[PDB]
Write an enzyme that holds these catalytic residues in place. Sequence first.
Site, short mmCIF file in Angstrom:
data_model
loop_
_atom_site.label_atom_id
_atom_site.label_comp_id
_atom_site.label_asym_id
_atom_site.label_seq_id
_atom_site.Cartn_x
_atom_site.Cartn_y
_atom_site.Cartn_z
CB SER A 1 -1.03 0.04 1.14
OG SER A 1 -2.26 -0.44 0.63
CE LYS B 1 -3.61 0.97 -2.01
NZ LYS B 1 -4.46 0.31 -0.94
CB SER C 1 -5.44 1.83 2.78
OG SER C 1 -4.31 1.20 2.22
CD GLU D 1 -3.93 -2.84 -4.11
OE1 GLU D 1 -4.03 -4.06 -3.85
OE2 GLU D 1 -3.26 -2.04 -3.40
CE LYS E 1 -2.06 3.99 1.70
NZ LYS E 1 -2.27 2.88 2.68
CB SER E 2 0.54 1.69 7.17
OG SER E 2 -0.89 1.69 7.00
N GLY E 3 1.26 -0.15 4.86
CA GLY E 3 0.92 -1.25 3.97
C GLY E 3 1.13 -2.60 4.61
CB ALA E 4 -0.53 -5.28 5.67
#
Length: 263
Positions: free
Chosen positions: A45, A48, A105, A141, A209-212
Amino acid sequence: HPETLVKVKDAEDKLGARVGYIELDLNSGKILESFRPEERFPMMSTFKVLLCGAVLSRVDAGQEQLGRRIHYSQNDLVEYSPVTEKHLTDGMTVRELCSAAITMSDNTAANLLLTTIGGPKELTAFLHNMGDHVTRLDRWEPELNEAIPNDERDTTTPAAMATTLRKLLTGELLTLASRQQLIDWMEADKVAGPLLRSALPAGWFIADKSGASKRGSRGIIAALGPDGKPSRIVVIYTTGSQATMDERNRQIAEIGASLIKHW
């Protein structure tokens, strides 16, 4: 600070995975700390934010307008689309799509934004045009989250991402109004509550901004600092863990608390 490198090294230990780390002074560009800076990790993520840079870049050139409304259908909805799913009849403006991609997100939103720039290939050309010949998006995505070991698609390095984000936020690429909008969405982020945010004392700025993704992947990119004081950029990625989500979250917070304590 070596104690922050120590927390990052503990994190490898506790997660049983590689962690990449960069701490960069935003104003001056000087790298303050690094660890595995040239290893690839899945962007997940965090991409983005790059994606909305590309869009804001089209806005500046007059190829895009933030007020333009996009209409989509039920079949564009992919898993995890908290905002896009509520506006099937209504559509969303490009500005509303960036806000959703950044602050929530929203995966459908990112796909829609990617359609506007002409796909993941064009995002990589955008990046390559701004000086990052490392980072690449290859898929849409949800497949960009796969995170297959050793697969270079949909990856970046802690050092490339940190300096790319540096150029987007304060470099000579975007207008003042676009820089400001990007930061505003990133400051409104809602999905990184348990990460760096939770280490932050009162009176601090943060835009993140995070992501997994699959195979235990976790990451965050951020600009942050005391209100009115020189900010730093922080970029943490880990991949390969079998550890729980919450324990990945807790290693990133502990890294954050060391960085803040030793600021």
